[PDB]
Enzyme design. Structure first.
Site, short mmCIF file in Angstrom:
data_model
loop_
_atom_site.label_atom_id
_atom_site.label_comp_id
_atom_site.label_asym_id
_atom_site.label_seq_id
_atom_site.Cartn_x
_atom_site.Cartn_y
_atom_site.Cartn_z
N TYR A 41 45.05 33.13 43.07
CA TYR A 41 44.10 34.26 43.19
C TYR A 41 43.82 34.92 41.84
O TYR A 41 42.81 35.64 41.74
CB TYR A 41 44.65 35.34 44.16
CG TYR A 41 44.75 34.80 45.55
CD1 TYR A 41 43.59 34.72 46.40
CD2 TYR A 41 46.00 34.36 46.05
CE1 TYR A 41 43.71 34.20 47.64
CE2 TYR A 41 46.09 33.86 47.34
CZ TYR A 41 44.99 33.82 48.08
OH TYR A 41 45.06 33.25 49.40
C1 LIG Z 1 44.46 40.17 39.66
C2 LIG Z 1 43.00 40.13 39.12
O1 LIG Z 1 42.72 38.79 38.73
P1 LIG Z 1 42.86 38.40 37.17
O2 LIG Z 1 44.35 38.31 36.82
O3 LIG Z 1 42.09 39.45 36.38
O4 LIG Z 1 42.17 37.01 37.15
C3 LIG Z 1 42.00 40.48 40.24
N1 LIG Z 1 42.11 39.75 41.50
C4 LIG Z 1 42.65 40.23 42.59
O5 LIG Z 1 43.11 41.36 42.64
C5 LIG Z 1 42.68 39.36 43.83
C6 LIG Z 1 42.79 40.27 45.06
C7 LIG Z 1 42.42 39.56 46.35
C8 LIG Z 1 43.11 38.24 46.46
C9 LIG Z 1 44.59 38.42 46.77
C10 LIG Z 1 44.78 39.34 47.97
S1 LIG Z 1 46.55 39.45 48.37
C11 LIG Z 1 40.59 40.33 39.69
O6 LIG Z 1 39.99 39.25 39.98
O7 LIG Z 1 40.10 41.22 39.00
#
Ligand SMILES: C[C@@H](OP(=O)(O)O)[C@H](NC(=O)CCCCCCS)C(=O)O
Ligand code: F43
Ligand SMILES: C[C@@H](OP(=O)(O)O)[C@H](NC(=O)CCCCCCS)C(=O)O
Ligand SMILES: O=S(=O)(O)CCS
Ligand SMILES: [Mg+2]
Ligand SMILES: [Mg+2]
Ligand SMILES: [Mg+2]
Ligand SMILES: [Mg+2]
Ligand SMILES: [Mg+2]
Ligand SMILES: [Zn+2]
Lengths: 246, 442, 548, 442
Positions: free
Chosen positions: D366
């Protein structure tokens, strides 16, 4: 002051509109009451509404700039800021949009002028706006066929004239009368019917339009043949370009 | 000295203070008063103790129209202000004799807070001011009344708002002249995101002092942005001196000559005559009844034209006592002067362009608002590199009451607190004194 | 031959295009228009059904005191009322933006390095094809590992898929060709060799997420959705544990280290995430448009296809909705892609430059800018003066300013082969126009215009940028209509005159060379006309899941 | 001093340096070496002259895979590095012989630049470092070769990238350990947005020096955020001292005792024993064959537990020589110690919560990635107030090559320039020496 380069009639007319020592030709007489009606901001005999109290009632702290700068009379009184707006046909109206804002800021005090393609506006304190407006309406700033007083629905600067030589107006505020040859203002600048119309005189004939116009066109004086005015525009371009670099 | 230029400095009554001050004595990089002003605006917070108390009593926290029924807390914060402020100060300071200031105003309804400078010398930025102030007052209010663990999060909401759900301190009852770092249009812009109305309120609408504070903030941002590095440095320093510091009394004398009956156009004619008389410009070429002017010092021509532009705003919006036409002055002063002379306008067209969009976004449906809500970080008014917004500050100082979004409407908390501070209120005085003091060190 | 706008002007007005006079006020207002008559009837029907007044032709002022004109879509023979070119009423225009918003380019270079070095498995064309079969099942929203997954309906997400491309022909030809953007098929030989040389042995995915998702959500969803399903498909196709430490390297690679967004995110006053119009730089918009690979014999056609792409997206959808809304900015943009007007001016300037200099043979300097931009400015302006019907057609000064200055700036860049002097020519055009007619555009039109000359060649922090790298977030350009799509045309102009395969990013150019897109990027103006005629079929609709 | 605590200070070899130093001598607000490290990280920029030259010659400017055909410029910037550097230094400096440093590295391929600290004492934030540096190099390149007005904008693009169309300096050939102010998750977060791989590269993978630099930066941000004000200040200082500074040799001695055969669980047993020996905890209640521990000093228990947590990372990830399991150590050291004792884990559960998300976002599809790409501003790892990230720094310093996104991959430009600076490289030496020097002034 020099105002504008060039050696055409257009250029000289641009300089004359800017120069407060040039006496604008008066072409028509309009009463004070009728200027008020055409502006549409207050009714005949209505006191000037206020936006703030008179300056003398305000007891302000010492400020050397304010002490040096004399307020216009409507500012002393606390008048609303109101406007007058004109549309100028590209078919050789005498004034045009940037000509107006440049001229207004050389001739008039306390002025907020705005330029657009289809409309040009001044906003100032209401009693002072009525005095300037008389001059904008009575003089060669205005032609009643090729210039229009229009607070809204301004389309027409770029349209073909009608068969009478009148600019288009979606709201038909200025009517030429086929039998008499005079224009009347039949609505105020926002498009509401006047109780009685205001005579605005005869449209200037073609020769006089050409004498007095400030637009350059291939069928009048072309800008590209006013080589001194083009030289200064090009100079400005090049000097701004070099100065932004180094 | 890197530059040989000297300027004469005056007070806000047009009297000479000090002759022949080296230009760099006014540099943000050298002048100690500009340093103290900028570190002051980083570190100073206005706390609205009355507003915190009222938000708690009604449970109206978290932003406009928000309320949590059942969460009301009635605490006598204003009646215990002295104690609360002293306890917050003990947490705010680093040591007991440092430069922390905590001063009650309005009978305890407000507090001026200046967080000690030293917290900033070990910080990346400036958010320690609101964040250290906010937590010290939240903790001091909790400890004054022994607010329980179950209720204390309402005190936090009343002081700092909906943060961190919101990015901003949405609904906060503290205020600063700076805004959060995330709102910068570019890196280096923080001293530009200072509402014009906050500058006019801090300086009590004294026109010259408002123009000076605005200039000092704008041109100091130009250094932080790197704009005033290298080729451009002298241009920026001369704009600061002539447009914002009334160098050589040029602004003042223009306004004196044009104030009674003058227009934007009369001020232009006088400035062109003065530039010629001083040797800043000369006739380069004669066209047909038209003199083409040139200069061998574009930074000084720019500065003289900038002083004229400030004078023209003072004359034009001073005669109307209405700020709105500053957008038109900023436009047509520059458009007229280029066709009057053959030389480029102030900031090589970028004041004129800022003024075109500022005029549009102060007279249309699409955005913007009245002059006082703009700032150097606003998308509409960021484009000129310091030479536009100080005129807007002067114009709002001269406005007699035509604005709905006036400094009284938008900046009352700022005004009460930040105008207490002498160097914020009267910066022209302090920067000129400091320049005269370091005159022989440049 | 007649000027290119004459047929349109004869269609619009009964008078000859040169005639200075007409009649107004005799057309019955809105009743002259088929489309306004449809709108008046629909407003009565909407208001009666919902119990709230809606469209009413008697509110405010009465449209159609003058002729309500048809417009010819340039390069077509389709004439429509301008309401049919409003983005709300034109499904091709909505799909053009959906197809950009829902696309992301995602390398496999770091990913294949993780597989070889960290998992210790081999990558070959065969393992790549097996990964592509897997990700084309998973990308539209279907499962590959867990039990009891519930999935998207395949027919609602039929527009979502993944393809790949590489500059190594022998590797491209070994991967199943169902998944491959074939550079040699899509591009003429010289451009194909340039593009393959840029890519080399690199392998890149073009990922398109579902239009129904993009419309539900936003552009910043695209690279995330992409990476989720890349991640699942790397688990399933290369036999990972379903969630081990190395899983996070494929996530970081697909979401950050080898992603190319169409647009970068915006600052807070105009806050938006990635893949929104304001983040799309002008050089990318010219590369998204595919006219370059079809109409390369005619650099005017290529450049003005890019102008159409950009005027629609940047003025109609971005400035006229994301950044404002309402009736919006249809004709601010249509002036640049209707009535063959900009085409007439720009062919004039291209021939002027051919005769005086030769394409790309002029010195790259201010002399050339002053010569070409001035000459082309005056030609354009003379056409409005000679033809009162042309002036009444492009009735707003901003529309004229953008059209005349686009022809002047593209012609200057055809002369110098460099977009920066093209951009200087655009600003000089505005300054001459303003002095010629004592007007230019709307109240705020020339904010960037007056800053313009000084910022063309500046090198300062938030001032200096080659034009290809500027975009709608360049500070001076962040607000106003009538500039951004024209700047994308000027960024294309020197590259089309030089015969360059791309303007700023070769991966973006390849990534839209794909007939599996819903919108046909090779013929943007043709598609706009198709949508205006209500003949375009968009993706994303909910008909399958709603009452018959 | 506000607090009574004293600590004994050791070097990175576990040898005593100074006994019984007051705790606040290690405070970011008092220790002059922490001030010089924070000011140095604000002001230091790595310039890649070879990357600039290569971007120009190929016209590959503005971000990944971008190129402008026809714009190539072939300039011999590395062959003329000395002249270019000197010309940039003259624009960067405020005065001759001030604290500006411009030093060539790698035979002119790179330059370490330290912009003068005075430019920051008149700035709101820290963007003057890249902005002043970039413009001085752009102008010195243009002036070295007489680059024309027509071409100079490509120099700009090769230095600073797609800014300002992009918010970041996208494609720039300069680098800082800080990132732009707009990317802060909250006000006050800037010293947290420093990638773990940057910290490990600058300290040359010395495990205790990487942990110290990371703890300095994290706990300094906790002051700027206001978290270490008032009630919380001692908790934060004791975390700094015991988890990051090896106070009392407690991290060192736990690692020595458990390094040959130990586990996370054997380190927990040793830390509980040492906290009971020292009177930090005591048995409060006996249940059936289980002792419930209590403490009269929660901050000190927190700090001892934090030292244990660091030692457990060094034992668990040092045994694997593989950083990934730091997410697991951060989780289960805390989860296990709470059920071992009945007392709350480090940061009252917030290290354990940070570790749950960090474990997920370093082993899932994710987001996140390997340990080295996290930082205190990352959404996954911001939640503990300084007590988690330094352990990630220690674990990446101990990684022997298991990562794709290693510091060699992500931080090579940072490494070459920032490891030159003695105080960034060996901050445990300099912070301890500075704390001993000021010991009788606290
Ligand atoms: C952590 C962060 O990702 P990066 O480390 O920045 O790639 C963030 N995603 C998320 O929070 C995914 C949340 C939903 C998927 C998991 C749910 S448990 C985002 O895309 O901005
Ligand atoms: C109220 C404003 C001020 C403002 O902030 N925006 C307005 C109005 C706004 C409305 C008009 C919709 C309506 O009628 O209800 C919309 C469509 C934006 C929206 N809210 O959807 C718009 N303008 Ni305007 N606006 C336009 C234009 C213009 C031209 C029109 C000149 C003329 O002679 O007709 C002038 C500026 C100028 O003089 O240069 C102009 C002014 C104005 N513009 C004047 C109203 C002028 C009038 O009273 O008639 N627009 C144009 O020049 C062409 C494109 C056109 C836009 C719609 C489209 O792109 O299809 C529209 C874009
Ligand atoms: C100026 C700014 O508005 P505010 O002053 O922040 O309300 C901005 N709008 C715009 O730029 C309007 C752009 C499109 C409408 C005018 C086109 S000329 C915005 O909403 O972020
Ligand atoms: O009239 S304005 O220029 O403000 C708006 C044009 S759409
Ligand atoms: Mg009379
Ligand atoms: Mg003479
Ligand atoms: Mg000729
Ligand atoms: Mg097709
Ligand atoms: Mg020992
Ligand atoms: Zn959407």
């Amino acid at each position: 002051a020099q105002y504008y380069p060039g050696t055409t009639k257009v250029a000289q007319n641009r300089r004359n509109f800017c120069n407060p020592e040039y006496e604008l030709e008066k072409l028509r007489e309009i009463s004070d009451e009728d200027v008020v009606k055409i502006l549409g901001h207050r009714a005949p005999g209505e006191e000037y509404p206020s936006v703030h109290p008179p300056l003398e009632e305000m007891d302000e702290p010492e400020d050397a700039i304010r002490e040096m700068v004399e307020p216009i009379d409507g500012a002393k009184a606390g008048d609303r800021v109101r406007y007058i707006q004109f549309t100028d046909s590209m078919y050789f109206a005498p004034a045009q949009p940037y000509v107006r804002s440049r001229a207004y800021l050389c001739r008039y005090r306390g002025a907020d002028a705005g330029t657009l393609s289809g409309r040009q506006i001044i906003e100032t304190r209401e009693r002072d706006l009525e005095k300037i407006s008389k001059e904008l309406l009575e003089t060669e700033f205005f032609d009643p066929a090729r210039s229009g007083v229009r607070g809204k629905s301004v389309h027409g600067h770029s349209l073909r004239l009608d068969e009478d030589g009148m600019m288009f107006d979606m709201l038909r505020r200025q009517i030429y009368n086929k039998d008499t040859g005079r224009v009347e203002m039949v609505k105020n600048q926002i498009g509401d019917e006047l109780d009685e119309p205001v005579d605005l005189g005869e449209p200037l004939d073609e020769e006089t339009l050409m004498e007095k116009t400030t637009i350059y066109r291939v069928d009048g004086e072309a800008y590209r043949d006013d080589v001194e005015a083009v030289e200064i525009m090009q100079r400005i371009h090049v000097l701004r370009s070099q100065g932004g670099f180094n | 000295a890197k530059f040989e230029d000297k300027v004469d400095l005056y007070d806000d009554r047009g009297n000479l203070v000090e002759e022949q001050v080296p230009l760099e004595a006014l540099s943000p990089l050298r002048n100690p008063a500009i340093k103290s002003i900028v570190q002051g605006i980083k570190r100073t917070v206005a706390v609205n103790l009355e507003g915190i108390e009222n938000a708690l009593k009604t449970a109206k926290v978290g932003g406009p129209a928000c309320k949590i029924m059942g969460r009301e807390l009635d605490l006598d914060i204003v009646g215990n202000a002295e104690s609360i402020a002293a306890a917050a100060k003990e947490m705010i300071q680093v040591t007991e004799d440092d430069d922390t200031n905590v001063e009650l105003l309005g009978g305890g309804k407000r507090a001026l807070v200046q967080v000690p400078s030293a917290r900033f010398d070990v910080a990346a930025e400036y958010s320690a001011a609101p964040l250290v102030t906010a937590t010290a007052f939240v903790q001091a209010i909790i400890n004054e009344f022994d607010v329980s663990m179950y209720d204390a999060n309402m005190v936090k909401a009343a002081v700092l708002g909906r943060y961190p759900q919101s990015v901003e301190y949405m609904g906060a009852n503290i205020a600063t002249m700076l805004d959060i770092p995330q709102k910068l249009e570019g890196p280096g812009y923080a001293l530009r995101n200072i509402m014009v109305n906050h500058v006019v309120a801090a300086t009590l609408k004294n026109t010259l002092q408002a123009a000076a504070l605005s200039t000092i903030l704008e041109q100091t941002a130009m250094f932080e942005m790197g704009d005033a590095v290298g080729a451009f440095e002298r241009m920026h320093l001369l704009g600061l001196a002539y447009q914002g510091m009334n160098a050589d009394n040029l602004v003042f004398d223009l306004v004196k000559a044009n104030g009674k009956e003058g227009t934007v156009g009369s001020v232009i004619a006088d400035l062109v005559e003065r530039a010629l008389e001083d040797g800043v410009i000369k006739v380069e070429k004669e066209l047909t009844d038209y003199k083409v002017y040139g200069t061998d010092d574009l930074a000084m021509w720019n500065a003289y034209a900038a002083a004229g532009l400030m004078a023209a705003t003072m004359v034009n919006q001073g005669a109307a006592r209405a700020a709105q036409g500053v957008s038109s002055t900023l436009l047509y002063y520059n458009d007229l002067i280029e066709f009057e002379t053959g030389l480029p306008s102030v900031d090589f067209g970028k004041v004129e362009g800022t003024a075109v969009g500022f005029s549009f976004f102060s007279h249309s449906i699409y955005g913007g608002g009245g002059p006082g809500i703009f700032n150097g970080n606003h998308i509409v008014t960021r484009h000129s590199k310091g030479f536009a917004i100080p005129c807007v500050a002067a114009a709002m100082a001269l406005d007699a009451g035509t604005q709905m979004f006036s400094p009284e409407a938008t900046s009352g908390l700022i005004k009460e607190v930040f105008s207490q501070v002498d160097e914020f209120r009267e910066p022209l005085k302090y920067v000129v004194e400091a320049a005269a003091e370091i005159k022989n060190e440049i | 031959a007649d000027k290119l706008f004459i047929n349109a002007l004869k269609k619009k007005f009964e008078e000859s295009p040169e005639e200075k006079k007409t009649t107004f006020y005799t057309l019955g207002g809105w009743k002259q228009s088929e489309r306004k008559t449809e709108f008046v009837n629909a407003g009565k029907e909407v208001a009666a059904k919902r119990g709230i007044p809606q469209y009413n032709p008697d509110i405010g002022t009465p449209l159609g005191q003058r002729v309500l004109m048809p417009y010819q879509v340039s390069t077509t023979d389709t004439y429509v009322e301008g309401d049919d070119l409003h983005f709300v009423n034109n499904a091709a225009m909505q799909q053009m933006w959906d197809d950009i918003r829902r696309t992301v380019i995602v390398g496999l270079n770091h990913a294949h390095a993780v597989i070889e070095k960290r998992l210790g498995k081999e990558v070959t064309p065969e393992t790549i094809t097996h990964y592509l079969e897997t990700v084309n099942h998973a990308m539209p929203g279907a499962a590959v590992v867990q039990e009891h997954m519930v999935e998207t309906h395949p027919a609602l997400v039929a527009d979502s898929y993944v393809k790949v491309f590489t500059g190594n022909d022998e590797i491209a030809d070994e991967i199943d060709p169902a998944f491959v953007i074939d550079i040699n098929k899509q591009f003429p030989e010289d451009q194909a060799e340039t593009l393959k040389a840029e890519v080399g042995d690199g392998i890149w995915q073009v990922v398109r997420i579902p239009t129904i998702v993009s419309r539900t959500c936003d552009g910043a969803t695209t690279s995330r959705w992409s990476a989720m399903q890349i991640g699942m498909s790397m688990i399933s196709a290369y036999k990972q544990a379903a969630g081990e430490a190395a899983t996070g390297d494929f996530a970081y690679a697909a979401k950050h280290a080898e992603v190319i967004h169409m647009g970068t995110y915006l600052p807070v006053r105009r806050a938006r995430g990635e893949n929104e119009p304001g983040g799309v730089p002008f050089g990318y918009l010219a590369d998204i448009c595919q006219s370059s690979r079809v109409n390369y014999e005619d650099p005017v056609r290529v450049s003005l296809d890019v102008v159409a792409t950009g005027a629609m997206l940047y003025d109609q959808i971005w400035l006229g909705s994301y950044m404002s809304g309402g009736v919006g900015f249809t004709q601010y943009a249509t002036a640049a892609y209707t009535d063959n007007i900009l085409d007439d001016f720009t062919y004039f300037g291209k021939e002027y430059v051919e005769d005086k200099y030769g394409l790309c043979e002029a010195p790259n300097n201010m002399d050339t800018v002053l010569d070409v931009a001035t000459e082309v400015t005056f030609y354009g302006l003379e056409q409005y003066e000679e033809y009162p019907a042309l002036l009444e057609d492009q009735f707003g000064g901003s529309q004229r300013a953008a059209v005349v200055a686009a022809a002047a700036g593209c012609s200057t860049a055809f002369a110098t082969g460099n977009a920066q002097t093209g951009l200087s020519g655009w600003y000089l055009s505005m300054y001459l126009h303003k002095e010629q007619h004592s007007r230019l555009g709307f109240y705020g039109y020339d904010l960037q215009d007056q800053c313009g000359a000084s910022n063309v060649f500046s090198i300062r922090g938030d001032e200096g940028l080659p034009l290809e790298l500027r975009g709608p977030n360049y500070p001076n350009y962040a607000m106003n209509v009538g500039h951004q799509g024209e700047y994308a045309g000027i960024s294309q102009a020197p590259h089309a005159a030089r015969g360059d395969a791309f303007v700023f990013n070769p991966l973006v150019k390849i990534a839209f060379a794909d007939d599996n897109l819903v919108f046909d990027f090779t013929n943007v103006r043709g598609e706009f006309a198709k949508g205006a005629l209500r003949e375009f079929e968009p993706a994303g609709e909910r008909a399958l899941i709603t009452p018959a």
